[PDB]
């Protein structure tokens, strides 16, 4: 289905860790579970919550970065383009 994507294995692991089920998802679902992952693992900066620190986390390996800012999502979107297989 054109509105779905298939996350590559390591990204799927992250989504499943946050409660997702299955192999195919809409982009909004991917974002929901990835956000839940960051929230429950409390990877965001407590004082400046737009900042996410993920050094040593599988999320950091996917990003190729120790941290990123939700205010400049480009690196996050780059990771999703590489890890979301589309039609």
């Amino acid at each position: 289905q054109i509105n779905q994507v298939r996350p590559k294995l390591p990204l799927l692991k992250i989504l499943h860790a946050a409660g997702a089920q299955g192999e195919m998802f809409t982009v909004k679902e991917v974002m929901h579970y990835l956000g839940q992952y960051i929230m429950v693992k409390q990877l965001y900066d407590q004082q400046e919550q737009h900042m996410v620190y993920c050094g040593g986390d599988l999320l950091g390996e996917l990003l190729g970065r120790q941290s990123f800012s939700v205010k400049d999502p480009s690196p996050l979107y780059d990771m999703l383009r590489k890890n979301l297989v589309t039609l």
């Binding site: 919550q49 737009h50 939700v70």
Partner: peptide, 12 residues
């Protein structure tokens, strides 16, 4: 001011 507030902005 919260992670959720900023994160929600990434999707319409």
């Amino acid at each position: 001011l919260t992670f959720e507030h900023y994160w929600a902005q990434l999707t319409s």
